[PDB]
Ligand SMILES: CSc1nn(-c2ccccc2)c2cc(NC(=O)C3CCNCC3)ccc12
């Protein structure tokens with residue numbers, strides 16, 4: 001179908017099928033057991049954020065890798081069930097579409113996770129070259145294969161140079177994995193998200209420390225953002241003013257899977273609507289907080 | 302009577318292959334992944350099929366995408382599926398299988414839906430005239446004992462050369478199952494059952510349990526890497542050493558492979574001794590491979 005120019009928010013990242021089983025007690029290797037319940041669930045950061053963008057009322061698209069098969073089929077159908085445009089998927093002739101097994105111990109809350117295989121090629125810079133950008137008002141990139149992703153950002157930068165300011169594509173990036181190669185991604189984007197887990201691995205004990213201690217790594221004029229779960233979230237821009245919003249805890253915490261992606265998507269959304277950074281931190285915290293008290297993404301409205 | 306019928310479960314196996322089992326609450330990356338049509342009766346058809354024996358599966362499926370996969374795989378193997386007891390109240394079973402590549406160990410997390418078990422009422426609708434052998438995965442006793450009843454009846458009215466051979470698998474240590482022991486010319490009991498029931502070895506289990514079989518029936522007990530044993534009406538104990546591959550990589554469906562190969566052998570007129578041995582040969586060969594393709 002036809003996508004009006006400059007209307008869509010794109011997220012580039014991982015889609016994965018999570019098979020989530022609820023057990024009484026962790027299984028002894030080599031046993032056989034009945035779970036209490038078992039859910040198949042579309043997962044992955046970029047993928048979760050797409051869902052949140054649609055439910056919020058943004059037109060949005062996912063770009064990641066998949067391979068023909070029954071897993072992709074279920075994933076594509078779950079994407080479409082959430083109104084996500086999947087026409088930018090990078091279909092692959094080699095490799096398994098990512099699938100993960102997660103086992104949630106019902107008598108202690110602990111998650112044991114068999115994570116997907118590494119067989120499937122990441123979206124590459126040459127793949128991104130073939131994409132007509134005029135669709136997108138905002139492009140958000142989940143840091144994975146950094147050396148390639150840098151080329152994509154450089155290509156968006158090149159596109160932008162020629163556009164009137166009112167047709168520039170905003171860019172955001174997320175570094176959520178404590179992996180040296182990713183750290184070069186700070187240098188890109190108007191908005192850079194850093195996870196609590198990355199901050200800590202770099203030795204920072206709080207949002208504020210993380211921001212003050214990493215802002216030097218981001219490009220001129222960029223905003224750097226760090227959610228710290230129940231401690232809410234900070235952002236730091238060019239003006240050096242450390243911004244903050246408290247959390248919005250829900251009556252009781254049901255499900256936190258994807259709360260971080262929900263917050264990313266919500267900030268992006270608010271910013272893309274022309275709200276202030278401070279207004280967007282708040283909204284982010286409000287939406288992610290609400291979601292944490294619901295199963296899945298259903299009632300975040 | 303050209304075909305073999307198996308009566309049990311078909312289950313979607315979502316398989317992860319890992320090089321060590323994850324410590325509780327840890328997170329490990331798997332070597333690779335695949336989907337497999339599994340379930341006992343389902344695995345046996347795979348095996349009979351591979352061995353060259355026309356066969357048919359009879360179990361409860363629920364229409365959907367899962368079933369479309371299962372059915373397609375069934376057919377890709379040449380398994381007659383026309384006897385499937387379709388439903389509308391429940392999903393088709395599935396499970397996660399973590400397969401330790403270092404010792405082929407397999408760990409199974411089963412999601413059992415509502416999908417009710419095939420019933421005598423479904424079975425009484427079966428043209429027994431196509432079947433040389435009928436094998437029954439022991440599940441709902443009460444309701445299957447009737448299925449057996451039907452077969453015993455049908456046999457009375459037939460030449461001692463046109464009778465239908467019957468095998469029963471008693472997989473679970475459940476008391477309801479203790480009565481299937483019971484019927485059939487060949488009774489398979491697993492190591493787990495035997496153990497979960499007071500016995501320390503195949504030889505013991507066969508002595509312990511023989512008193513419960515139909516006159517002239519063979520009691521069979523596999524015992525993993527120790528091989529397998531059998532006991533007939535003549536009271537001579539039969540053993541077969543295992544055939545371990547040099548590298549065990551995937552034992553998912555070993556037992557079922559053993560059962561199918563014994564059944565195949567017996568249905569070709571081989572002696573019980575030859576059948577025990579062929580059973581271990583194929584099960585062993587399969588434990589050296591991921592999946593089933595390549596046993597023959
Ligand atoms: C800044 S927006 C945000 N709010 N909350 C939140 C606030 C109050 C009560 C409950 C949740 C979050 C929780 C997580 N994530 C988790 O808490 C996970 C729990 C398991 N360990 C990983 C973190 C991620 C983001 C948020």
Ligand SMILES: CSc1nn(-c2ccccc2)c2cc(NC(=O)C3CCNCC3)ccc12
Pocket residue numbers: 030406407523524525526527528529543544545546549552555556559580581584585588
């Ligand atoms: C009698 S035919 C047979 N051979 N093998 C075999 C022999 C040597 C190496 C590997 C396998 C089997 C293994 C199982 N079953 C298992 O190994 C199970 C694995 C999980 N723990 C329970 C036993 C069941 C039957 C057989």
